[PDB]
Design an enzyme around this catalytic site. Structure first.
Site, PDB file in Angstrom:
ATOM      1  N   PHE A  29      15.378  19.659  -0.230  1.00 30.14           N
ATOM      2  CA  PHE A  29      14.207  19.249  -0.487  1.00 30.14           C
ATOM      3  C   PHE A  29      13.697  17.600  -0.046  1.00 30.14           C
ATOM      4  O   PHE A  29      12.686  17.435   0.611  1.00 30.14           O
ATOM      5  CB  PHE A  29      14.122  19.015  -2.054  1.00 30.14           C
ATOM      6  CG  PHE A  29      12.677  18.251  -2.527  1.00 30.14           C
ATOM      7  CD1 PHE A  29      12.838  17.281  -3.474  1.00 30.14           C
ATOM      8  CD2 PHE A  29      11.469  18.885  -2.393  1.00 30.14           C
ATOM      9  CE1 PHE A  29      11.586  16.841  -4.052  1.00 30.14           C
ATOM     10  CE2 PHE A  29      10.240  18.357  -2.822  1.00 30.14           C
ATOM     11  CZ  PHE A  29      10.567  17.361  -3.599  1.00 30.14           C
ATOM     12  N   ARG A  81     -11.865   5.697   7.627  1.00 31.05           N
ATOM     13  CA  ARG A  81     -10.587   5.404   6.742  1.00 31.05           C
ATOM     14  C   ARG A  81      -9.797   4.627   7.888  1.00 31.05           C
ATOM     15  O   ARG A  81      -9.770   4.845   9.055  1.00 31.05           O
ATOM     16  CB  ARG A  81      -9.828   6.401   6.312  1.00 31.05           C
ATOM     17  CG  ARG A  81     -10.401   7.383   5.432  1.00 31.05           C
ATOM     18  CD  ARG A  81      -9.461   8.391   4.942  1.00 31.05           C
ATOM     19  NE  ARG A  81      -9.427   9.448   5.889  1.00 31.05           N
ATOM     20  CZ  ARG A  81     -10.227  10.393   6.214  1.00 31.05           C
ATOM     21  NH1 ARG A  81     -11.364  10.358   5.708  1.00 31.05           N
ATOM     22  NH2 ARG A  81      -9.931  11.261   7.125  1.00 31.05           N
ATOM     23  N   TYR A 106       0.865  -1.134  -0.197  1.00 27.35           N
ATOM     24  CA  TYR A 106      -0.109   0.076   0.050  1.00 27.35           C
ATOM     25  C   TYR A 106       0.798   1.275   0.145  1.00 27.35           C
ATOM     26  O   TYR A 106       0.834   2.194  -0.748  1.00 27.35           O
ATOM     27  CB  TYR A 106      -0.950   0.071   1.128  1.00 27.35           C
ATOM     28  CG  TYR A 106      -1.809   1.297   1.147  1.00 27.35           C
ATOM     29  CD1 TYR A 106      -2.513   1.637   0.304  1.00 27.35           C
ATOM     30  CD2 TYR A 106      -1.502   2.295   2.093  1.00 27.35           C
ATOM     31  CE1 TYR A 106      -3.476   2.959   0.233  1.00 27.35           C
ATOM     32  CE2 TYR A 106      -1.973   3.614   2.145  1.00 27.35           C
ATOM     33  CZ  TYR A 106      -3.047   3.982   1.166  1.00 27.35           C
ATOM     34  OH  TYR A 106      -3.619   5.060   1.261  1.00 27.35           O
ATOM     35  N   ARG A 125       0.320   8.950  13.081  1.00 31.08           N
ATOM     36  CA  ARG A 125      -0.027  10.140  13.744  1.00 31.08           C
ATOM     37  C   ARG A 125      -1.510  10.284  13.362  1.00 31.08           C
ATOM     38  O   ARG A 125      -2.308  10.869  14.317  1.00 31.08           O
ATOM     39  CB  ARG A 125       0.608  11.109  13.248  1.00 31.08           C
ATOM     40  CG  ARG A 125       0.530  12.375  13.991  1.00 31.08           C
ATOM     41  CD  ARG A 125      -0.539  13.303  13.250  1.00 31.08           C
ATOM     42  NE  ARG A 125      -0.128  13.681  12.120  1.00 31.08           N
ATOM     43  CZ  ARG A 125       0.802  14.565  11.704  1.00 31.08           C
ATOM     44  NH1 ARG A 125       1.393  15.223  12.780  1.00 31.08           N
ATOM     45  NH2 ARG A 125       1.223  14.901  10.484  1.00 31.08           N
TER      46      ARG A 125
HETATM   47  C1  LIG Z   1      12.782  11.557  -2.902  1.00 35.58           C
HETATM   48  O1  LIG Z   1      11.532  11.587  -2.432  1.00 35.58           O
HETATM   49  C2  LIG Z   1      10.745  12.684  -1.749  1.00 35.58           C
HETATM   50  C3  LIG Z   1      11.623  13.749  -1.629  1.00 35.58           C
HETATM   51  C4  LIG Z   1      11.028  15.060  -0.968  1.00 35.58           C
HETATM   52  C5  LIG Z   1       9.793  14.852  -0.723  1.00 35.58           C
HETATM   53  C6  LIG Z   1       8.748  13.855  -1.015  1.00 35.58           C
HETATM   54  C7  LIG Z   1       7.662  13.746  -0.301  1.00 35.58           C
HETATM   55  O2  LIG Z   1       7.355  14.702   0.752  1.00 35.58           O
HETATM   56  C8  LIG Z   1       6.055  14.669   1.212  1.00 35.58           C
HETATM   57  C9  LIG Z   1       6.160  15.494   2.474  1.00 35.58           C
HETATM   58  C10 LIG Z   1       5.249  16.590   2.911  1.00 35.58           C
HETATM   59  O3  LIG Z   1       4.391  16.686   1.985  1.00 35.58           O
HETATM   60  N1  LIG Z   1       5.135  17.344   3.818  1.00 35.58           N
HETATM   61  C11 LIG Z   1       4.468  18.471   4.214  1.00 35.58           C
HETATM   62  C12 LIG Z   1       5.198  19.759   4.353  1.00 35.58           C
HETATM   63  C13 LIG Z   1       6.562  19.820   5.274  1.00 35.58           C
HETATM   64  C14 LIG Z   1       7.298  20.854   5.084  1.00 35.58           C
HETATM   65  C15 LIG Z   1       6.862  22.094   5.387  1.00 35.58           C
HETATM   66  O4  LIG Z   1       6.140  22.265   6.611  1.00 35.58           O
HETATM   67  O5  LIG Z   1       6.896  23.503   4.821  1.00 35.58           O
HETATM   68  C16 LIG Z   1       7.154  18.429   4.687  1.00 35.58           C
HETATM   69  C17 LIG Z   1       6.378  17.132   4.608  1.00 35.58           C
HETATM   70  C18 LIG Z   1       5.140  13.469   0.986  1.00 35.58           C
HETATM   71  C19 LIG Z   1       4.572  12.695   1.961  1.00 35.58           C
HETATM   72  C20 LIG Z   1       3.983  11.604   1.532  1.00 35.58           C
HETATM   73  C21 LIG Z   1       3.965  11.781  -0.109  1.00 35.58           C
HETATM   74  N2  LIG Z   1       4.854  12.989  -0.200  1.00 35.58           N
HETATM   75  C22 LIG Z   1       5.136  13.650  -1.342  1.00 35.58           C
HETATM   76  C23 LIG Z   1       4.301  14.059  -2.117  1.00 35.58           C
HETATM   77  C24 LIG Z   1       4.658  14.756  -3.296  1.00 35.58           C
HETATM   78  C25 LIG Z   1       5.959  14.975  -3.551  1.00 35.58           C
HETATM   79 CL1  LIG Z   1       6.376  15.831  -5.020  1.00 35.58          CL
HETATM   80  C26 LIG Z   1       6.963  14.838  -2.774  1.00 35.58           C
HETATM   81  C27 LIG Z   1       6.531  14.088  -1.312  1.00 35.58           C
HETATM   82  C28 LIG Z   1       9.577  12.508  -1.499  1.00 35.58           C
HETATM   83  O6  LIG Z   1       8.816  11.552  -1.594  1.00 35.58           O
HETATM   84  C29 LIG Z   1       9.109  10.275  -0.772  1.00 35.58           C
END
Ligand SMILES: COc1cccc([C@H]2O[C@H](CC(=O)N3CCC(CC(=O)O)CC3)c3cccn3-c3ccc(Cl)cc32)c1OC
Length: 335
Positions: free
Chosen positions: A253, A193, A136, A183
């Site tokens: 990033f 969900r 998943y 969390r």
């Molecule tokens: C190499 O892989 C990554 C590198 C950077 C970021 C991600 C990933 O980060 C967010 C993490 C996230 O969204 N948050 C919210 C904002 C936070 C920072 C802030 O508060 O400004 C960090 C955690 C996330 C969690 C689950 C899926 N994703 C995701 C979706 C789409 C992209 Cl392009 C990248 C992500 C990555 O995906 C695993």
């Protein structure tokens, strides 16, 4: 910037908030590539998440989403979700996808095809085994990690190993996703969900929603600790992944979410509040973490201090106590 690309960055700021700035800091062609991938993933997730869309409508949508990227007129007007503008104005997003160099379009399209297959697979099941939990999470987050890594290598800002090591990239996603799933127990429960693995929770209670009841709080916290110990297993791969990155903007990033999940797992560990509400790290704490997470020594130091914090909080009687100590010991000794 074209009108269409300006609109994309507006959606990025609306949808990712303070995270938009980190994406806007990416060097060269990576900036637009990741902005558009982020929005495309938002659109796919909005379709997946939307309980108002029937399974019979949702399966073709998820399966064919990769094709919509190439269909200039495609949009979806029937979503009831919060980020529905990305679906209603999908033509603007797909226009900009089609403006990316083909080496980036092809990464994004492949990832969307594979994620859609997996998402469709999970519409008529909950998560049973820990293995199914990894499957998943691969589908909804590990493949994001993989996609992004391929954009980094395809742009030539990072070595090809970054894009090719699917397992390390996968672990980047699994770590984040499991931290969120853990969390978000209560808000998910209340939303109908269920993402905690049945193989794990069913060893404590009869139904997953039983953890919301005051009489089961000891059992709920034991289950929480067990799942957290599971997520910690990805840390060695996270360290390995981050240590290979040579571009500063890519590093920041990638590192930012990882250190914020670390802090969030630390906040949630042995914490009864997980079953009463949303446990969040403080904004000032998140800001410092984000500023600090710019090199490996700094990131390792953060990981080590939060792992130590969890280590010293482990209740002797916790069913997972030896497992938690072992994974923490492994992490501390590799670097
Ligand atoms: C190499 O892989 C990554 C590198 C950077 C970021 C991600 C990933 O980060 C967010 C993490 C996230 O969204 N948050 C919210 C904002 C936070 C920072 C802030 O508060 O400004 C960090 C955690 C996330 C969690 C689950 C899926 N994703 C995701 C979706 C789409 C992209 Cl392009 C990248 C992500 C990555 O995906 C695993």
């Amino acid at each position: 910037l074209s009108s269409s690309l300006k609109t994309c960055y507006k959606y990025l700021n609306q949808t990712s908030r303070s995270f938009a700035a980190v994406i806007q800091a990416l060097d060269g062609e990576m900036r637009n590539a990741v902005c558009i991938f982020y929005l495309v993933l938002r659109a796919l997730d909005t379709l997946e998440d939307d309980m108002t869309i029937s399974v019979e409508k949702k399966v073709p949508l998820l399966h064919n989403f990769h094709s919509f990227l190439y269909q200039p007129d495609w949009r979806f007007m029937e979503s009831k979700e919060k980020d529905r503008q990305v679906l209603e104005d999908f033509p603007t997003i797909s226009l900009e996808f089609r403006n990316l160099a083909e080496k980036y379009q092809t990464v994004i399209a492949d990832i969307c095809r594979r994620m859609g297959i997996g998402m469709a697979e999970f519409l008529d099941k909950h998560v049973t085994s820990e293995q199914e939990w990894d499957k998943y999470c691969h589908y909804v987050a590990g493949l994001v990690g993989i996609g992004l890594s391929r954009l980094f290598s395809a742009s030539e800002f990072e070595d090809p190993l970054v894009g090719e090591d699917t397992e390390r990239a996968n672990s980047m996603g699994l770590f984040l996703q499991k931290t969120n799933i853990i969390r978000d127990y209560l808000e998910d429960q209340q939303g109908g969900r269920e993402f905690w693995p049945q193989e794990v929770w069913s060893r404590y209670v009869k139904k997953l929603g039983d953890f919301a009841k005051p009489e089961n709080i000891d059992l709920a916290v034991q289950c929480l600790n067990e799942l957290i110990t599971n997520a910690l297993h990805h840390i060695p791969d996270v360290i390995t992944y981050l240590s290979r990155l040579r571009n500063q903007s890519v590093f920041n990033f990638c590192a930012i979410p990882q250190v914020m999940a670390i802090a969030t797992l630390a906040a949630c560990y042995n914490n009864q509040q997980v079953f009463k509400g949303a446990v969040k790290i403080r904004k000032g704490q998140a800001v410092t973490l984000m500023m600090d997470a710019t090199n490996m020594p700094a990131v390792k130091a953060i990981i080590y201090q939060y792992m130590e914090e969890i280590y010293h909080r482990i209740p002797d009687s916790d069913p997972s106590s030896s497992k938690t100590r072992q994974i923490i010991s492994t992490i501390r000794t590799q670097n």
